[PDB]
């Protein structure tokens, strides 16, 4: 992403929506739900807060943080070796290898009995109130505005309180701004293209940056001169 994620409070979107006379029954309560829906539907990883938090494994099981949404990595605390996805169907079940993990709810199922594991996860940036905090990018703001307007107009169209042409226009505009917002947050910046370039050109390919925390992924590959 080229631009920086400067955070602003949620009613910034209600400042802009309520300019429309047909959206004056919208509320913070509705904006919260539709904002969370938009955040998930776009799935942008720059909108989440990166956190690292250690936990203990009692026996092939560990308690997971409260605010976790998605895991970047899990690794062993003492070695630093990363874990992979668990493909085993009988992990801690005995009868009569490398470490891996599997997470469903508040519980992470590892293949290790008693160790500390480090989890690098993504959460939502919250407010002084326990509420979501949105980027102030006017592209993001316009796209979220258009998302909420599209949902409200879809309800009102299901009633027959909006013309089909009005909803068709709203859907067209939301679709274009959704694509544009997707490209805004995903296209790398200059530093991210230097990292991608140093990942791309290897005379000797590097294929083991998962073992580390992808630390050396964008490190330049130097060849000595002979």
């Amino acid at each position: 992403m080229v631009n920086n994620i400067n955070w602003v409070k949620l009613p910034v979107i209600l400042d802009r929506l309520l300019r429309h006379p047909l959206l004056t029954d919208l509320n913070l309560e509705t904006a919260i739900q539709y904002t969370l829906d938009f955040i998930s539907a776009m799935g942008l990883p720059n909108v989440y807060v990166d956190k690292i938090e250690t936990i203990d494994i009692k026996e092939y099981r560990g308690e997971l943080p409260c605010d976790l949404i998605s895991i970047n990595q899990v690794r062993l605390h003492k070695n630093g070796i990363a874990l992979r996805a668990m493909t085993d169907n009988f992990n801690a079940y005995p009868t009569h290898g490398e470490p891996s993990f599997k997470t469903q709810g508040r519980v992470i199922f590892t293949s290790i009995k008693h160790e500390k594991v480090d989890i690098s996860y993504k959460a939502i940036m919250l407010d002084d109130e326990g509420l979501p905090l949105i980027p102030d990018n006017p592209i993001f703001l316009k796209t979220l505005e258009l998302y909420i307007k599209k949902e409200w107009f879809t309800i009102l169209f299901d009633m027959g309180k909006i013309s089909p042409a009005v909803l068709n226009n709203t859907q067209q505009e939301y679709a274009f701004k959704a694509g544009q917002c997707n490209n805004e947050f995903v296209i790398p910046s200059v530093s991210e293209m230097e990292a991608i370039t140093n990942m791309w050109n290897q005379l000797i390919p590097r294929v083991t940056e998962f073992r580390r925390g992808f630390k050396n992924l964008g490190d330049k590959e130097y060849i000595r001169v002979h």
């Binding site: 027959g160 013309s163 089909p164 042409a165 068709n168 226009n169």
Partner: peptide, 28 residues
Amino acid sequence: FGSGAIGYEFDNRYLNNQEMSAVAKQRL
């Protein structure tokens, strides 16, 4: 005698129906 309750609402409904036809002919 007179009373415009049913008359007014039927006229309003007629106007709403040609309203919907007119807007349903609108295309971007």
